[PDB]
Amino acid sequence: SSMSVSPGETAKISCGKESIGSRAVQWYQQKPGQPPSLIIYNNQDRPAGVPERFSASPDFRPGTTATLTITNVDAEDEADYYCHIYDARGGTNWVFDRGTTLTVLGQPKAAPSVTLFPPSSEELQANKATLVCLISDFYPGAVTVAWKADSSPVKAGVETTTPSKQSNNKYAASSYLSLTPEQWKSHKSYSCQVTHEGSTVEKTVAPT
Amino acid sequence: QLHLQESGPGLVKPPETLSLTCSVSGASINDAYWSWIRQSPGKRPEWVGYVHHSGDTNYNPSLKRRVTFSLDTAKNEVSLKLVDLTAADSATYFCARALHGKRIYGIVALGELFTYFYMDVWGKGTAVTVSSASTKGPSVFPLAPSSKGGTAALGCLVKDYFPEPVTVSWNSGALTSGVHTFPAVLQSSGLYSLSSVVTVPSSSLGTQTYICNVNHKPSNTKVDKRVEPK
Ligand SMILES: [Zn+2]
Ligand SMILES: [Zn+2]
Ligand SMILES: [Zn+2]
Ligand SMILES: [Zn+2]
Ligand SMILES: [Zn+2]
Ligand SMILES: [Zn+2]
Ligand SMILES: [Zn+2]
Ligand SMILES: [Zn+2]
Ligand SMILES: [Zn+2]
Ligand SMILES: [Zn+2]
Ligand SMILES: [Zn+2]
Ligand SMILES: [Zn+2]
């Protein structure tokens, strides 16, 4: 989940599904290279040390969603946010639910550069095949990646890395697709489709 | 002045089992509830369990049969133990202090209440990898540029090796510019794979040579490969 705002502004974040019974909710913040730290407990209470710009919603009735608010956003608010839910009727969760990845902008936005390589004849003699999709220079640091054959979805046989930070504060990533030589020959094209922020880029290769 | 610190083995080859410790400083281990938590890169934090010296202890249903905690008074130390390991046990392991509260929403005598935990102090965590593979050097293939911006892109696919790390350079380090070397993926096989790319002036592909240099210390292997237009 991804979100961006400018310094000085206000962020609103939802988490988890709607309530069934009475609730007790905890919120957690996590910066790059750090363990999580605690910011709200018991729905609306604030541990000592935590600034007053952070606040959350009390539990009043069934049918509602947990929500967190940050007023006057500072650059040091850039982080991942998680919640942990206890519900009298739905039971105890053992995994934290997701809020969002939050970026506090200091630069213009930038679309990804993408390059796509067919499998070499060297590799084909070895009875193997691999497609390689390389993605560089995007900001902010989140994208999704989809593979397509002729005009059909793929899904099975894909591996994709997390984003990582280049030395000019932009991001990069990679995706791979594994094929049998017979599969590579028995279709007409293959595509790699990359989505940044509701916009999509696409590259395509052929056996010929 | 409460402070926590984890310790572990690092790499584990699995007929063996995992054993972790946590040092506590600024309180006695009998004064509180203690928790362990784990997290894979890109994924959501996962709650393992909690212990009290009274014996009010419970474990996550996901791995309840293979994990146990214990307490050692003389060392002032919390410990974790897991058996039957596969490669999905690979993670970063955190220890923490768990405070507790009660949520009361009706008449107590009718059991209209419940217990909840929240975590206020954590350690920096320890990284654990599980693998059943044997050391193996990489195969190296060329990613050829096309003949058809004014620029072309070319590189090296560095395939099926173990374990990390690997260093990669171009033309014996005399070409430092335009190069993107990407971090690796882990296949269902058990071995790694990464790639390195350079973008170049396409009006020089008939006069210039490009060669990547790969080095894999754990197998004592070095490779040099020349990449060419087709
Ligand atoms: Zn959920
Ligand atoms: Zn609804
Ligand atoms: Zn309440
Ligand atoms: Zn419950
Ligand atoms: Zn974009
Ligand atoms: Zn490129
Ligand atoms: Zn088909
Ligand atoms: Zn006691
Ligand atoms: Zn109690
Ligand atoms: Zn570059
Ligand atoms: Zn996989
Ligand atoms: Zn050399």
Author numbering:
A (entry chain A): 8 to 9, 11 to 67, 67A, 67B, 67C, 68 to 92, 96 to 98, 98A, ...
B (entry chain B): 1 to 82, 82A, 82B, 82C, 83 to 100, 100A, 100B, 100C, ...
Publication text:
Identified from African donor 17 of the IAVI Protocol G cohort, the PGT121 antibody family consists of three primary members (PGT121, PGT122 and PGT123), and additional antibodies from this donor described recently. At an IC50<50 µg/mL, this family of bnAbs neutralizes 65–70% of HIV-1 isolates and also recognizes an N332-sensitive epitope. One of the main characteristics of the paratope is a 24-residue HCDR3 that forms an extended anti-parallel β-hairpin with either a type-1 β-turn at its tip for PGT121 and PGT123 or a distorted 310-helix at its tip for PGT122.
